[PDB]
Design a protein around this ligand. Structure first.
Ligand SMILES: *[C@@H]1O[C@H](CO)[C@@H](O[C@@H]2O[C@H](CO)[C@@H](O[C@@H]3O[C@H](CO[C@H]4O[C@H](CO[C@H]5O[C@H](CO)[C@@H](O)[C@H](O)[C@@H]5O)[C@@H](O)[C@H](O)[C@@H]4O)[C@@H](O)[C@H](O)[C@@H]3O)[C@H](O)[C@H]2NC(C)=O)[C@H](O)[C@H]1NC(C)=O
Ligand SMILES: CCCCCCCC/C=C\CCCCCCCC(=O)O[C@H](COC(=O)CCCCCCCCCCCCCCC)COP(=O)([O-])OCC[N+](C)(C)C
Ligand SMILES: CCCCCCCC/C=C\CCCCCCCC(=O)O[C@H](COC(=O)CCCCCCCCCCCCCCC)COP(=O)([O-])OCC[N+](C)(C)C
Ligand SMILES: CCCCCCCC/C=C\CCCCCCCC(=O)O[C@H](COC(=O)CCCCCCCCCCCCCCC)COP(=O)([O-])OCC[N+](C)(C)C
Ligand SMILES: CCCCCCCC/C=C\CCCCCCCC(=O)O[C@H](COC(=O)CCCCCCCCCCCCCCC)COP(=O)([O-])OCC[N+](C)(C)C
Ligand SMILES: CCCCCCCC/C=C\CCCCCCCC(=O)O[C@H](COC(=O)CCCCCCCCCCCCCCC)COP(=O)([O-])OCC[N+](C)(C)C
Ligand SMILES: COCC(CCO[C@H]1CC[C@@]2(C)C(=CC[C@H]3[C@@H]4C[C@@H]5O[C@]6(CC[C@@H](C)CO6)[C@@H](C)[C@@H]5[C@@]4(C)CC[C@@H]32)C1)COC
Ligand SMILES: C[C@@H](OC(=O)c1ccccc1)C1=CC[C@@]23OCCN(C)C[C@@]12C[C@@H](O)[C@]12O[C@]4(O)CC[C@@]1(C)[C@H](CC=C32)C4
Ligand SMILES: C[C@@H](OC(=O)c1ccccc1)C1=CC[C@@]23OCCN(C)C[C@@]12C[C@@H](O)[C@]12O[C@]4(O)CC[C@@]1(C)[C@H](CC=C32)C4
Ligand SMILES: CC(C)CCC[C@@H](C)[C@H]1CC[C@H]2[C@@H]3CC=C4C[C@@H](OC(=O)CCC(=O)O)CC[C@]4(C)[C@H]3CC[C@]12C
Ligand SMILES: CC(C)CCC[C@@H](C)[C@H]1CC[C@H]2[C@@H]3CC=C4C[C@@H](OC(=O)CCC(=O)O)CC[C@]4(C)[C@H]3CC[C@]12C
Ligand SMILES: CC(C)CCC[C@@H](C)[C@H]1CC[C@H]2[C@@H]3CC=C4C[C@@H](OC(=O)CCC(=O)O)CC[C@]4(C)[C@H]3CC[C@]12C
Ligand SMILES: CC(C)CCC[C@@H](C)[C@H]1CC[C@H]2[C@@H]3CC=C4C[C@@H](OC(=O)CCC(=O)O)CC[C@]4(C)[C@H]3CC[C@]12C
Ligand SMILES: CC(C)CCC[C@@H](C)[C@H]1CC[C@H]2[C@@H]3CC=C4C[C@@H](OC(=O)CCC(=O)O)CC[C@]4(C)[C@H]3CC[C@]12C
Ligand SMILES: *[C@@H]1O[C@H](CO)[C@@H](O[C@@H]2O[C@H](CO)[C@@H](O)[C@H](O)[C@H]2NC(C)=O)[C@H](O)[C@H]1NC(C)=O
Length: 1237
């Protein structure tokens, strides 16, 4: 009834309606949406035909509606298209019929996919010109349909009205313009964006992505403000420090126009001499110029070398603090924590070791807090649209031999359904995934046969279960749920591998039997959650994954044809020695890998190579665009998955010691000893034997510490009950520590020192700091929080252990003994060509001069135990470079590697990261969030990481943030004071002050290392004007008030910053006429960022976000008290174990474990899980030709080798322990951010 064929009388009626016409359309009637069944199913004769409009909102105007077989509402234009085409024209009727046809949409979709394939081919064949013409013809043909059906721009719903249709018009007009330097074809890849327009599902997701980034202006402004403020701090502190180089010593010849000579050569001038790169000193191992510093903490050049400022720069010239432009980039990289340890070591080496305080604040105030603030908002923004989407569903519902065969069929059915049969199958699955885990590199004939024989017996059992199941219930009913389907495909996949094994030279399908371990999800709940996370990404979140896949492909082909030509021609400017670059862009597969590497968080490493090849300006835009856009989609996908898927004497003495134990003076006495005993541990450096008076003093102190603590335990034992002491977990912790100390002391006095087990027990003195946990309530409440999560953490670790067991066994099968390289020690650690040494047999054949060592990668796939460490390094993105490089080079069993031979081994590492590092991490954070949410509810809706006293202060300080607008200040009746009051209280005065802050902020970015005296004087004069006017505006605003400086707390911040600026601006003039400050002048110069910090008053969004950090300050302090204690404990472990190790990649002469100061620097670097692979490598190696045992050492030890056993345990546990504590910090801000919203 409602639907009818369009008629001219109906058009005239709509005209009359518009006539007397000269407040919201219905959601259910919007375009590209399904029509409700209330109006009725359109007849087959009316589908694809013009029908009158249904919504009264558009009834006034000339609009009409069509529907397809799928009943999608389409609103076209009824006004004359192109001024000649009436809506009733037969050609227009044919055009609109083909526009709504679902077959037409599939035609465009298939064409785009074919075009996307043809755009990924570098150096296309010359016959593709017709294909480009055909794609141009098709795209113009479908574009002409829109013009022939809707108009061009004139009437409401038209072609160039929806923003997405501009893309099609731009593509066709640009394609024809090209048909009417060759790098301008990069615009043709925009045809891949048309996929989003074709699929209606993808369009809404893109709209959701824009909304997510729209709710980020306050955070993005704060992020830019924080980075710019920190850049000015870094600029004024390390201005030109990175240019320090160990220039060779020289002497100046007398006369001869000031010529300078080297040891044997002569240079014309000092400028020419020093700028030469052949007289510097390269760092050991790497090809890096060794930085230095005149400070007492920075590095030192060896004999014959001196520290001089002049030089080019580190990292080809792109890593410097000389200008604000470089300072911003060098600190945005710190914000992302992409290779930040390289800048961490370079700045400490050049400036000094004390400057790690600056890196601590940048990593916290700029990286840890700000990135988490970004992630907190995206989760908040998604929760807002998720609620609305669910709300739109709620309102929709409110409105609305045969008898023998049968006899044996039921008999086997009885056996199959029996629960013991299923349990044995699960037990068989567990054994099968464990028997085949007994795979290593150096096998034997018997072991390989036993493992091979075990394959058929396990495969044969599964076939019998499948054979019995297909006949038991029903052949058709057997398929049913996918659990039965999944078993069928896997069991027949193994049979294909076994049948192929007769000719199976390349057998890898046997590694797919591990997928049967997923059958354990029936009983395991956590395994089910992991499957649901993966299923949601391909299921309900299919569109979001498709958008990410589409975006990654586009950025892969954008860079392939933009930098592909330059990479091939200028490969020598980025080649290691003489070969191709490892990460180039001349091929699509390598182009995609760089995009994937950028998504993983490593961008600047490949940015330097591209900037040195193609162009600095262009490479900066593309690499940063994929960094912002790529992470925005990935973070949206990661957060979407997480939220969607989730006698009287005895009595008398007992009372006396009870009183003394409970006395407060006793409690602080023990705390004093706990801190002192922990402090003396760090004193045992490698120079202890040199200091004769400190080694005996520490030994006496150790005796006193173990005598006081024993007395304390005895007093508690006598006073408190035996059950009371042993029922307290904290008291048990102290009991073990003292027991270890007592055993070591009693063994030393017994004359049984320096033995095997006793000497290992002395190292366990590093657990002495653990006694401080039970005393400070700030740390005890944090420990109480992580103890409650131990059952939840253990469940996730088992699932990740099973998930990583599949990849480790599969990785062992793919690579086992293929990581061996026959290196030549005379040259260096460089694999040789196969034209000389082909395998291990040939390497030993030429082993006549004793210089060919068949070494192997320290972290490799030789067995499941060794494979677990490699997966950990790959998943953590630390040290994975040396794994993929040695894996995409494998050339068979015990064969010499070749450049990119077996190149597609990169796919194995990419898939693992998507599954074992992305989805696995998503499961862990989801469980931890769920667990700690339960603890908050269990505790009574109170913060978990906060003490009782801190709660009072935080609650009291929370009320301080209440906005209570006070009454206006009375006008002073001094005429002149009243006049200045009127011109000051006006808000326009604050705008002028705010404008002056930006000008002062701008004039500090002009600072550069190459500062001429004329530029210095002009800037000094400009600063003098700024400090004068600011004092003037402070002296007139205060003059009007004169009695209420206490109120408006921002009015005291500017008063002290002006006084500080007044002190600074007069000391600088004094300093020029007084003793020159070597480094104190930098501080007073740098103390001017207070003016920049005055912008908080005028920014509401910035102030609110900063208020959340102040809320989370007491919570973060408690968590950080524990992390530093753990870092302190591990540092003492490092000095006792990893001292006197060979200096190598991660262990320089300044970042070793010899001293507490040096070990503290290393552990802070590993706290962010950065560069832990580089530090682990010098411990893993043992024996020649890498290490050299039987080497004399000062502290009794011998040999500079490493300990692979404890070296792996030390770094693996600390990486995990730090991550849990860091995660505790990530959510503490989020909960505070959610509450403050
Ligand atoms: C090719 O041919 C060479 C020479 O025959 C082989 O090199 C030897 O390989 C064996 C193992 O197969 C090594 O034996 C090991 O020796 C350890 C004791 O240390 C020995 O060398 C120490 C000297 O230091 C060496 O390394 C440093 C660098 O760290 C160099 O600067 C030195 O020049 C030395 O090369 C000394 O203490 C002393 O010489 C020791 O003998 C021992 O702890 C191990 O258990 C093992 O027995 C041997 O050291 C290697 N070199 C020597 C001296 O012969 C090479 O393996 C062959 N490669 C193949 C596979 O073809
Ligand atoms: C490379 C190659 C591996 C390829 C594996 C292909 C598996 C296909 C499974 C299949 O048919 O889909 C389903 C699995 O259904 C399951 O529940 C099995 C889950 C198994 C998860 C395995 C993850 C492996 C990760 C490995 C990572 C490395 C079964 O089909 P269904 O979806 O049940 O079909 C009906 C659906 N409705 C109609 C009921 C909705
Ligand atoms: C969404 C959209 C995102 C868009 C993001 C970024 C795009 C916009 C910014 C970059 C535009 C191009 C700039 C350019 O080419 O400059 C160059 C100089 O470059 C420098 O001097 C270094 C600049 C480093 C980067 C600055 C910090 C960015 C931190 C991140 C952003 C800020 C932090 C917050 C992020 C939220 C130009 O040099 P040139 O000499 O003029 O030309 C040389 C050309 N040849 C000779 C080589 C051919
Ligand atoms: C690596 C392994 C790490 C394992 C880490 C954490 C696992 C801790 C498990 C604790 C289980 C017992 C819980 C209990 O009763 O008391 C808990 C505290 O427990 C603790 O504080 C344990 C501290 C352990 C510190 C590391 C020791 C190993 C170092 C190895 C170094 C090498 C609860 O607090 P409480 O105040 O006792 O509750 C009293 C409740 N009533 C009686 C009042 C109702
Ligand atoms: C019992 C373990 C024995 C053991 O393996 O001893 C050592 C552990 O060595 C390590 O590196 C492990 C360090 C573990 C730190 C745990 C912190 C817990 C924090 C909990 C925080 C809770 C709250 C959150 C290994 O043996 P060793 O003693 O090195 O053997 C002698 C070696 N030399 C000296 C001969 C070379
Ligand atoms: C809360 C709890 C937190 C902590 C939880 C527990 C964490 C870790 C517990 C680790 C316990 C064992 C530590 C030492 C093991 C060791 O040295 O073995 C080595 C080999 O085996 C390995 O390399 C070990 C690999 C597995 C451990 C690292 C990856 C963990 C991934 C976790 C993923 C978690 C996902 C979630 C020994 O090598 P070697 O025999 O010296 O070599 C030959 C030496 N000779 C003979 C040539 C001289
Ligand atoms: O020539 C070809 C010889 C086989 C080889 C090396 C080639 C390409 C992809 C390689 C596969 C990637 C897959 O990636 C894996 C791991 C990750 C999962 C997608 C499962 O498949 C390997 C088993 C699979 C793989 C390593 C099996 C061997 C394949 C080149
Ligand atoms: C964050 C994540 O990815 C990145 O690092 C990353 C960096 C830049 C851009 C994008 C991503 C991690 C890499 C691996 C990891 O490494 C430790 C340090 N990181 C910070 C934490 C992660 C995640 C952790 O849950 C953990 O992953 C596990 O699979 C499960 C539990 C885990 C503790 C186990 C051991 C190491 C893990 C194994
Ligand atoms: C730098 C940063 O590291 C990370 O946690 C981190 C996490 C993820 C990625 C990268 C890095 C820190 C986060 C919190 C911290 O504790 C953790 C350990 N680090 C080394 C030191 C920081 C910073 C410190 O200034 C400190 O922050 C405070 O808020 C103020 C002073 C502080 C000493 C107090 C106690 C602990 C702090 C509390
Ligand atoms: C940069 C590349 C350029 C060629 C510009 C010109 C037209 C632009 C497009 C114009 C409109 C849109 C729609 C916009 O999303 C929406 O407006 C939501 C959907 C809707 O409009 O209902 C997302 C960006 C996008 C694709 C723009 C992407 C960048 C484009 C292709
Ligand atoms: C994630 C979605 C929105 C896709 C984003 C794609 C853009 C990052 C690409 C698409 C087209 C590209 C442009 C295509 C062509 C050129 C011309 C090029 O200059 C030339 O004249 C060619 C090179 C030369 O000869 O020097 C500079 C880069 C630029 C603007 C490219 C910049 C990067 C663009 C905008
Ligand atoms: C969960 C526990 C698994 C992670 C464990 C249980 C059994 C372990 C396996 C037991 C025995 C071996 C043989 C072992 O073979 C060797 O070459 C080691 C030295 C030797 O031969 O004695 C390599 C590790 C491996 C596969 C182990 C790897 C780790 C496994 C699978
Ligand atoms: C995405 C849309 C815009 C943000 C893009 C499209 C075209 C881009 C421009 C394309 C080419 C260049 C040249 C590029 O190199 C230079 O300007 C070099 C100057 C020199 O060498 O002297 C700097 C970035 C810029 C302006 C790009 C800036 C960003 C633009 C305007
Ligand atoms: C009963 C359940 C709770 C046991 C859980 C054990 C797991 C925590 C796994 C994870 C990693 C495993 C380790 C991985 C590798 C090895 C090396 C393995 O020794 C070798 O085969 C040498 C390998 C080499 O160095 O080449 C001995 C077992 C061990 C310590 C494994 C012991 C069991 C571990 C700790
Ligand atoms: C290992 O590397 C060296 C080069 O560092 C190869 O060349 C030898 O180098 C030494 C020292 O310069 C010369 O004295 C020899 O005459 C060189 N031998 C030659 C010509 O090969 C050395 O050959 C390599 N080791 C091998 C392959 O035995």
């Amino acid at each position: 009834s409602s639907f009818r064929r369009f008629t001219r009388e109906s058009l005239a009626a709509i005209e009359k309606r518009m006539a007397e016409k000269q407040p919201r359309p219905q959601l259910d009637l919007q375009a590209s949406k399904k029509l409700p069944d209330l109006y009725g199913n359109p007849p087959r004769e009316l589908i694809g035909e013009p029908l009158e409009d249904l919504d009264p909102f558009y009834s006034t105007q000339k609009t009409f509606i069509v529907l397809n077989k799928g009943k999608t509402i389409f609103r076209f234009s009824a006004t004359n298209a192109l001024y000649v085409l009436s809506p009733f024209h037969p050609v227009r009727r044919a055009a609109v019929k083909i526009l709504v046809h679902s077959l037409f949409s599939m035609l465009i979709m298939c064409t785009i996919l074919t075009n996307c394939v043809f755009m990924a081919q570098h150096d296309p064949p010359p016959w593709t010109k017709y294909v480009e013409y055909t794609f141009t013809a098709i795209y113009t043909f479908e574009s002409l349909v829109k013009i022939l059906a809707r108009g061009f721009c004139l009437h409401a719903f038209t072609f160039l009205r929806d923003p997405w249709n501009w893309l099609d018009f731009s593509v066709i007009v640009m394609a024809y313009t090209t048909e009417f330097v060759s790098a301008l074809r990069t615009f043709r890849v925009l045809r891949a964006l048309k996929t989003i327009s074709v699929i209606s599902g993808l369009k809404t997701i893109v709209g959701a992505l824009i909304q997510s980034v729209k709710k980020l202006a306050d955070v993005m402004v704060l992020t830019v403000f924080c980075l710019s403020v920190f850049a000015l701090i870094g600029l004024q502190l390390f201005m030109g420090n990175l240019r320090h180089k160990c220039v060779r010593n020289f002497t100046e010849l007398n006369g001869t126009n000031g010529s300078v000579e080297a040891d044997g050569l002569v240079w014309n001038s000092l400028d020419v001499y020093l700028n030469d790169p052949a007289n510097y000193l390269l760092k050991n191992g790497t090809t890096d110029v060794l930085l230095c510093g005149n400070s007492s903490d920075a590095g030192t050049c060896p004999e014959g070398y001196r520290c001089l400022k002049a030089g080019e720069n580190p990292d080809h010239g792109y890593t410097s603090f000389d200008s604000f432009a470089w300072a911003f980039l060098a600190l945005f990289r710190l914000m992302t924590q992409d290779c930040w340890e390289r800048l961490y070591q370079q700045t400490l080496r050049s400036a000094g070791k004390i400057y790690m305080i600056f890196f601590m604040l940048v990593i916290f105030l700029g990286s840890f807090y700000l990135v988490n603030l970004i992630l907190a908002v995206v989760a908040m923004a998604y929760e807002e649209q998720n609620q609305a989407t669910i709300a739109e569903t709620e309102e929709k519902e409110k409105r609305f031999c045969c008898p023998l065969w049968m006899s044996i069929k039921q008999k086997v059915k009885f056996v199959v359904m029996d629960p013991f049969a299923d349990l044995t199958i699960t037990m068989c699955i567990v054994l099968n995934t464990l028997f085949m885990a007994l795979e290593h590199y150096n096998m034997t004939a018997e072991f390989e046969e036993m493992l091979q024989v075990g394959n058929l017996v396990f495969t044969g059992i599964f076939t019998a279960e499948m054979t019995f199941k297909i006949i038991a219930l029903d052949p058709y009913y057997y398929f049913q749920q996918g659990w039965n389907i999944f078993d069928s495909i896997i069991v027949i996949l193994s049979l294909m591998e076994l049948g192929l094994s007769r000719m199976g030279n390349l057998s890898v399908l046997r590694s797919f039997r591990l997928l049967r371990v997923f059958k354990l999800a029936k009983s395991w709940p956590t395994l089910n959650t992991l499957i649901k996370i993966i299923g949601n990404s391909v299921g309900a979140l299919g569109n979001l994954t498709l958008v990410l896949a589409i975006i990654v492909f586009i950025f892969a082909v954008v860079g392939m044809q933009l930098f592909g030509k330059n990479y091939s021609e200028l490969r020598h400017r980025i080649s290691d020695s003489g070969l191709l670059p490892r990460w180039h862009m001349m091929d699509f597969f390598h182009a995609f890998l760089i995009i994937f590497r950028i998504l993983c968080g490593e961008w600047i490493e490949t940015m330097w190579d591209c900037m040195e090849v193609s162009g600095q300006s262009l490479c900066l835009l593309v690499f940063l665009l994929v960094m912002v856009i790529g992470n925005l989609v990935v973070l949206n996908l990661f957060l979407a998955l997480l939220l969607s898927s989730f006698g009287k004497v005895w009595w008398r003495l007992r009372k006396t010691c009870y009183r003394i134990v409970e006395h407060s003076w006793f409690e602080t006495f023990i705390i004093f000893m706990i801190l002192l005993s922990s402090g003396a541990l760090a004193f045992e450096d490698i120079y202890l034997e040199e200091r004769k008076t400190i080694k005996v003093l520490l030994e006496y102190a150790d005796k006193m510490f173990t005598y006081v603590f024993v007395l304390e335990m005895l007093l508690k034992w006598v006073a408190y009950g035996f059950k009371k002491y042993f029922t307290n977990a904290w008291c048990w912790l102290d009991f073990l520590i003292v027991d270890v100390s007592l055993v070591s002391l009693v063994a030393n006095t017994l004359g049984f020192a320096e033995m095997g087990p006793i000497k290992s027990l002395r190292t366990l003195r590093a657990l002495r700091p653990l006694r401080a946990l039970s005393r400070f309530e700030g740390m005890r409440v944090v420990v109480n929080a992580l103890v409650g999560a131990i059952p939840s953490i253990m469940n996730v670790l088992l699932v990740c252990l099973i998930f990583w067991l599949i990849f480790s066994i599969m990785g062992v099968n793919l690579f086992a003994g293929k990581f061996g390289r026959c290196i030549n020690q005379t040259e260096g650690d460089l694999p040789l060509n196969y034209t000389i040494v082909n395998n291990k047999s040939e390497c030993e054949s030429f082993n006549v001069t004793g210089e060919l060592y068949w070494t192997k990668v320290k972290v490799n796939f030789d067995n499941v135990g060794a494979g677990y460490l490699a997966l950990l390094q790959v998943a953590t993105f630390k040290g994975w470079m040396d794994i993929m490089y040695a894996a995409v080079d494998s050339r068979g069993y015990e064969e010499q590697p070749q450049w990119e031979d077996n190149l597609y081994m990169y796919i194995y590492f990419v898939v693992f990261i998507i599954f074992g590092s992305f989805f696995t991490l998503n499961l862990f954070i989801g469980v931890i969030i769920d667990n700690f949410n339960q603890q908050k509810k269990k505790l009574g809706g109170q913060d978990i990481f906060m003490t009782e006293e801190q709660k009072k202060y935080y609650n009291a300080m929370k009320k301080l943030g209440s906005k209570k607008p006070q009454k206006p200040i009375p006008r002073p009746l001094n005429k002149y004071q009243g006049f200045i009051f009127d011109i000051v209280t006006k808000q326009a005065f604050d705008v002028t002050i705010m404008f002056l802050i930006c000008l002062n902020m701008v004039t500090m970015m002009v600072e550069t290392d190459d500062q001429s005296p004329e530029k210095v004087n002009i800037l000094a004069k400009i600063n003098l004007l700024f400090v004068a006017i600011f004092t003037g505006e402070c002296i007139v605003k205060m003059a009007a008030l004169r009695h209420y400086y206490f109120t408006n707390s921002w009015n005291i911040f500017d008063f002290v910053v002006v006084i500080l600026s007044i002190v600074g601006t007069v000391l600088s003039d004094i300093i020029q006429k007084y003793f020159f400050s070597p480094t104190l002048f930098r501080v007073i110069r740098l103390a001017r960022i207070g003016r920049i910090l005055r912008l908080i008053r005028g920014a509401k969004g910035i102030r609110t976000l900063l208020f959340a950090l102040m809320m989370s300050l007491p919570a973060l302090f408690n968590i950080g008290l524990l992390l530093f204690l753990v870092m302190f404990i591990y540092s003492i472990f490092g000095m006792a174990n990893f001292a006197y190790v060979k200096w190598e990649a991660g262990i320089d002469d300044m970042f070793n474990f010899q001293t507490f100061a040096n070990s503290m620097l290393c552990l802070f670097q590993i706290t962010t899980s950065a560069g832990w692979d580089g530090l682990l490598s010098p411990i893993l190696n043992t024996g020649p030709p890498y290490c050299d045992p039987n080497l004399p050492n000062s502290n009794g030890s011998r040999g500079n080798c490493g300990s692979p056993a404890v070296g792996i345990l030390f770094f693996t546990t600390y990486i995990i322990i730090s991550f849990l504590i860091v995660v505790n910090m990530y959510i503490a801000i989020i909960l505070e951010n959610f509450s403050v919203a």
